[PDB]
Amino acid sequence: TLSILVAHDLQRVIGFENQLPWHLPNDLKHVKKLSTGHTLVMGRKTFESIGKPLPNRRNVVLTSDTSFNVEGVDVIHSIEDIYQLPGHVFIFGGQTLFEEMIDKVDDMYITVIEGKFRGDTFFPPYTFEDWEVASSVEGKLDEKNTIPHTFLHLIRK
Ligand SMILES: NC(=O)C1=CN([C@@H]2O[C@H](COP(=O)(O)OP(=O)(O)OC[C@H]3O[C@@H](n4cnc5c(N)ncnc54)[C@H](OP(=O)(O)O)[C@@H]3O)[C@@H](O)[C@H]2O)C=CC1
Ligand SMILES: Nc1nc(=O)c2c([nH]1)NCC(CNc1ccc(C(=O)N[C@@H](CCC(=O)O)C(=O)O)cc1)=N2
Protein backbone atom coordinates (compact mmCIF):
# COMPACT_ATOMS: atom_id res chain seq x y z
CA THR A 1 0.00 0.00 0.00
CA LEU A 2 1.39 3.35 -1.16
CA SER A 3 0.49 6.69 0.49
CA ILE A 4 1.87 10.23 0.58
CA LEU A 5 2.39 11.68 4.03
CA VAL A 6 2.96 15.48 4.12
CA ALA A 7 2.26 18.71 5.96
CA HIS A 8 2.00 21.78 3.71
CA ASP A 9 0.88 25.36 4.32
CA LEU A 10 -1.75 27.43 2.44
CA GLN A 11 0.73 27.94 -0.42
CA ARG A 12 2.03 24.35 -0.35
CA VAL A 13 5.31 25.10 1.44
CA ILE A 14 6.80 21.96 3.03
CA GLY A 15 10.31 23.15 3.98
CA PHE A 16 12.63 26.04 4.66
CA GLU A 17 16.41 25.62 4.84
CA ASN A 18 16.06 21.84 5.24
CA GLN A 19 13.71 22.17 8.21
CA LEU A 20 9.96 22.49 8.78
CA PRO A 21 8.98 26.17 9.09
CA TRP A 22 6.38 25.50 11.80
CA HIS A 23 6.34 23.71 15.11
CA LEU A 24 3.30 21.53 15.56
CA PRO A 25 3.85 18.65 18.02
CA ASN A 26 0.39 17.29 17.21
CA ASP A 27 1.23 16.70 13.57
CA LEU A 28 4.40 14.82 14.46
CA LYS A 29 2.22 12.77 16.80
CA HIS A 30 0.00 12.37 13.73
CA VAL A 31 2.91 11.10 11.66
CA LYS A 32 3.92 8.78 14.50
CA LYS A 33 0.43 7.28 14.65
CA LEU A 34 0.15 6.76 10.91
CA SER A 35 3.66 5.42 10.27
CA THR A 36 4.63 3.43 13.38
CA GLY A 37 4.84 -0.25 12.45
CA HIS A 38 5.15 0.47 8.73
CA THR A 39 7.55 1.98 6.20
CA LEU A 40 8.70 5.56 5.55
CA VAL A 41 10.40 6.30 2.23
CA MET A 42 12.27 9.62 2.14
CA GLY A 43 14.91 11.48 0.11
CA ARG A 44 18.43 11.99 1.40
CA LYS A 45 18.02 15.64 2.38
CA THR A 46 14.93 14.78 4.40
CA PHE A 47 16.74 11.97 6.23
CA GLU A 48 19.63 14.29 6.94
CA SER A 49 17.17 16.80 8.27
CA ILE A 50 15.69 14.17 10.59
CA GLY A 51 19.23 12.97 11.23
CA LYS A 52 18.26 9.63 12.81
CA PRO A 53 15.95 6.82 11.84
CA LEU A 54 12.45 7.18 13.21
CA PRO A 55 11.88 4.67 16.03
CA ASN A 56 9.69 1.64 15.55
CA ARG A 57 9.17 1.58 11.80
CA ARG A 58 11.15 0.87 8.63
CA ASN A 59 13.10 3.96 7.49
CA VAL A 60 14.08 3.77 3.80
CA VAL A 61 16.24 6.49 2.20
CA LEU A 62 16.40 7.14 -1.53
CA THR A 63 19.84 8.47 -2.48
CA SER A 64 22.18 8.28 -5.47
CA ASP A 65 25.03 7.76 -3.00
CA THR A 66 26.43 4.23 -3.15
CA SER A 67 28.51 5.05 -0.04
CA PHE A 68 25.30 5.49 1.94
CA ASN A 69 25.06 2.85 4.63
CA VAL A 70 23.41 4.20 7.76
CA GLU A 71 22.49 2.35 10.93
CA GLY A 72 18.78 1.58 11.22
CA VAL A 73 18.18 2.52 7.60
CA ASP A 74 17.62 0.69 4.36
CA VAL A 75 18.87 2.49 1.27
CA ILE A 76 17.39 2.45 -2.19
CA HIS A 77 18.76 4.11 -5.33
CA SER A 78 15.79 4.33 -7.71
CA ILE A 79 12.05 5.06 -7.46
CA GLU A 80 11.29 1.63 -8.94
CA ASP A 81 12.73 0.14 -5.76
CA ILE A 82 9.79 1.61 -3.84
CA TYR A 83 7.38 -0.68 -5.66
CA GLN A 84 9.08 -3.79 -4.26
CA LEU A 85 8.71 -2.67 -0.64
CA PRO A 86 6.17 -4.75 1.32
CA GLY A 87 3.39 -3.41 3.51
CA HIS A 88 1.99 0.08 3.89
CA VAL A 89 4.58 2.43 2.41
CA PHE A 90 4.35 6.16 3.18
CA ILE A 91 6.19 8.52 0.81
CA PHE A 92 7.55 10.99 3.28
CA GLY A 93 9.26 13.70 1.22
CA GLY A 94 10.73 15.81 0.11
CA GLN A 95 9.75 17.97 -2.81
CA THR A 96 11.58 15.74 -5.25
CA LEU A 97 9.96 12.49 -4.11
CA PHE A 98 6.49 14.09 -3.81
CA GLU A 99 6.75 15.34 -7.39
CA GLU A 100 7.99 11.95 -8.50
CA MET A 101 5.23 10.04 -6.70
CA ILE A 102 2.07 12.22 -6.53
CA ASP A 103 0.61 10.58 -9.64
CA LYS A 104 1.53 7.12 -8.37
CA VAL A 105 0.13 6.99 -4.87
CA ASP A 106 -3.25 5.48 -3.95
CA ASP A 107 -3.96 8.10 -1.32
CA MET A 108 -2.48 11.06 0.52
CA TYR A 109 -2.44 11.98 4.17
CA ILE A 110 -2.07 15.74 4.13
CA THR A 111 -1.88 18.09 7.06
CA VAL A 112 -2.89 21.51 5.81
CA ILE A 113 -1.17 24.09 7.96
CA GLU A 114 -3.50 27.07 7.83
CA GLY A 115 -0.81 29.73 7.59
CA LYS A 116 1.62 31.29 5.10
CA PHE A 117 5.29 30.63 5.91
CA ARG A 118 8.46 31.52 4.03
CA GLY A 119 9.61 28.39 2.21
CA ASP A 120 12.08 27.09 -0.31
CA THR A 121 10.49 23.72 -0.94
CA PHE A 122 6.97 22.92 -2.10
CA PHE A 123 4.33 20.24 -2.49
CA PRO A 124 3.15 20.03 -6.08
CA PRO A 125 -0.20 21.57 -6.99
CA TYR A 126 -3.13 19.15 -7.07
CA THR A 127 -6.84 19.52 -7.69
CA PHE A 128 -9.79 18.18 -5.71
CA GLU A 129 -11.23 17.23 -9.07
CA ASP A 130 -8.78 14.31 -8.85
CA TRP A 131 -8.90 13.56 -5.16
CA GLU A 132 -11.76 12.66 -2.95
CA VAL A 133 -11.92 13.67 0.70
CA ALA A 134 -12.16 10.40 2.64
CA SER A 135 -11.90 12.52 5.80
CA SER A 136 -11.20 16.02 7.10
CA VAL A 137 -10.55 16.60 10.81
CA GLU A 138 -9.57 19.95 12.36
CA GLY A 139 -6.54 19.65 14.62
CA LYS A 140 -6.96 20.88 18.16
CA LEU A 141 -5.35 24.14 19.24
CA ASP A 142 -3.74 24.54 22.67
CA GLU A 143 -0.64 26.07 24.23
CA LYS A 144 1.86 23.84 22.38
CA ASN A 145 -0.05 23.68 19.07
CA THR A 146 -0.94 27.17 18.05
CA ILE A 147 -1.30 27.16 14.28
CA PRO A 148 -4.61 25.89 12.93
CA HIS A 149 -4.27 22.71 10.93
CA THR A 150 -6.43 20.12 9.21
CA PHE A 151 -5.80 16.42 8.69
CA LEU A 152 -6.97 15.41 5.23
CA HIS A 153 -7.12 11.88 3.98
CA LEU A 154 -7.53 12.05 0.19
CA ILE A 155 -8.17 9.17 -2.19
CA ARG A 156 -7.56 9.23 -5.90
CA LYS A 157 -10.82 9.43 -7.84
N1 LIG B 1 6.52 19.23 5.51
C2 LIG B 1 6.70 17.94 5.22
O3 LIG B 1 5.65 17.00 5.15
C4 LIG B 1 8.10 17.47 4.95
C5 LIG B 1 9.04 18.45 4.68
N6 LIG B 1 10.21 18.13 4.10
C7 LIG B 1 11.13 19.23 3.82
O8 LIG B 1 11.49 19.15 2.47
C9 LIG B 1 12.81 19.63 2.29
C10 LIG B 1 13.61 18.54 1.57
O11 LIG B 1 13.09 18.39 0.26
P12 LIG B 1 14.10 18.37 -0.98
O13 LIG B 1 15.01 19.52 -0.79
O14 LIG B 1 13.35 18.19 -2.24
O15 LIG B 1 14.97 17.04 -0.72
P16 LIG B 1 14.57 15.49 -0.56
O17 LIG B 1 14.20 15.20 0.84
O18 LIG B 1 13.57 15.10 -1.58
O19 LIG B 1 15.97 14.78 -0.87
C20 LIG B 1 16.59 15.11 -2.08
C21 LIG B 1 17.55 13.99 -2.38
O22 LIG B 1 16.88 12.74 -2.42
C23 LIG B 1 17.56 11.88 -3.30
N24 LIG B 1 16.71 11.49 -4.43
C25 LIG B 1 15.52 12.05 -4.79
N26 LIG B 1 15.06 11.39 -5.87
C27 LIG B 1 15.95 10.42 -6.21
C28 LIG B 1 15.98 9.48 -7.22
N29 LIG B 1 14.98 9.41 -8.11
N30 LIG B 1 17.04 8.60 -7.31
C31 LIG B 1 18.07 8.67 -6.38
N32 LIG B 1 18.03 9.61 -5.38
C33 LIG B 1 17.00 10.48 -5.30
C34 LIG B 1 18.74 12.68 -3.82
O35 LIG B 1 19.80 12.42 -2.94
P36 LIG B 1 21.33 12.38 -3.47
O37 LIG B 1 21.66 13.80 -3.87
O38 LIG B 1 22.16 11.92 -2.29
O39 LIG B 1 21.37 11.45 -4.65
C40 LIG B 1 18.24 14.11 -3.72
O41 LIG B 1 19.22 15.11 -3.72
C42 LIG B 1 13.34 19.97 3.67
O43 LIG B 1 13.17 21.34 3.93
C44 LIG B 1 12.42 19.21 4.60
O45 LIG B 1 12.27 19.86 5.83
C46 LIG B 1 10.50 16.85 3.75
C47 LIG B 1 9.58 15.84 4.01
C48 LIG B 1 8.37 16.15 4.61
N1 LIG C 1 2.11 15.31 7.93
C2 LIG C 1 3.45 15.47 8.07
N3 LIG C 1 3.96 16.35 9.03
C4 LIG C 1 5.37 16.53 9.21
O5 LIG C 1 5.74 17.35 10.08
C6 LIG C 1 6.23 15.75 8.38
C7 LIG C 1 5.74 14.89 7.44
N8 LIG C 1 4.33 14.74 7.26
N9 LIG C 1 6.55 14.07 6.61
C10 LIG C 1 7.98 14.12 6.88
C11 LIG C 1 8.50 14.95 7.81
C12 LIG C 1 9.98 14.99 8.10
N13 LIG C 1 10.31 15.61 9.41
C14 LIG C 1 10.11 14.95 10.62
C15 LIG C 1 10.64 15.53 11.79
C16 LIG C 1 10.44 14.91 13.01
C17 LIG C 1 9.70 13.72 13.10
C18 LIG C 1 9.49 13.06 14.37
O19 LIG C 1 10.31 13.25 15.39
N20 LIG C 1 8.47 12.21 14.58
C21 LIG C 1 8.34 11.40 15.81
C22 LIG C 1 7.27 11.95 16.76
C23 LIG C 1 7.82 13.10 17.62
C24 LIG C 1 6.81 13.52 18.64
O25 LIG C 1 6.16 12.63 19.26
O26 LIG C 1 6.66 14.76 18.86
C27 LIG C 1 7.99 9.99 15.42
O28 LIG C 1 8.16 9.07 16.27
O29 LIG C 1 7.52 9.78 14.26
C30 LIG C 1 9.17 13.15 11.92
C31 LIG C 1 9.38 13.75 10.69
N32 LIG C 1 7.67 15.87 8.57
Distance from CA of residue 124 to its chain's centroid? 13
Give the mutation target among 3, 6, 13, 14 for probing the ligand 1 site: most ligand atoms within 8 A of CB: 14
CA 58, CA 54: separation in Å to the nearest integer?
8
C-alpha angle 73-26-23 in degrees, rounded to nearest 5: 80
Q: Are 123 and 6 in contact (CB under 8 A)?
A: yes
Amino acid making up residue 93: G
CA 56, CA 97: separation in Å to the nearest integer?
22
CA 91, CA 153: separation in Å to the nearest integer?
14
Q: Are 111 and 4 in contact (CB under 8 A)?
A: no
Way it was determined: X-ray
What residues are designated binding site? 5-7, 14-19, 27, 43-46, 49, 57, 62-65, 92-97, 100, 121
Per-residue DSSP letter, 22? S
What residues are designated binding site for substrate? 5-6, 27, 49, 57, 92
Domains of the chain: 1-157 (3.40.430.10)
Closest by Cα among 57, 56, 74, 152 to 113: 152
Cite the DSSP H helix spans in 2-142: 25-35, 44-50, 95-101
Task: Determine the 3-state secondary structure of 1 from DSSP.
Answer: coil
Closest by Cα among 154, 140, 103, 149 to 8: 149
Q: Are 41 and 82 in contact (CB under 8 A)?
A: yes
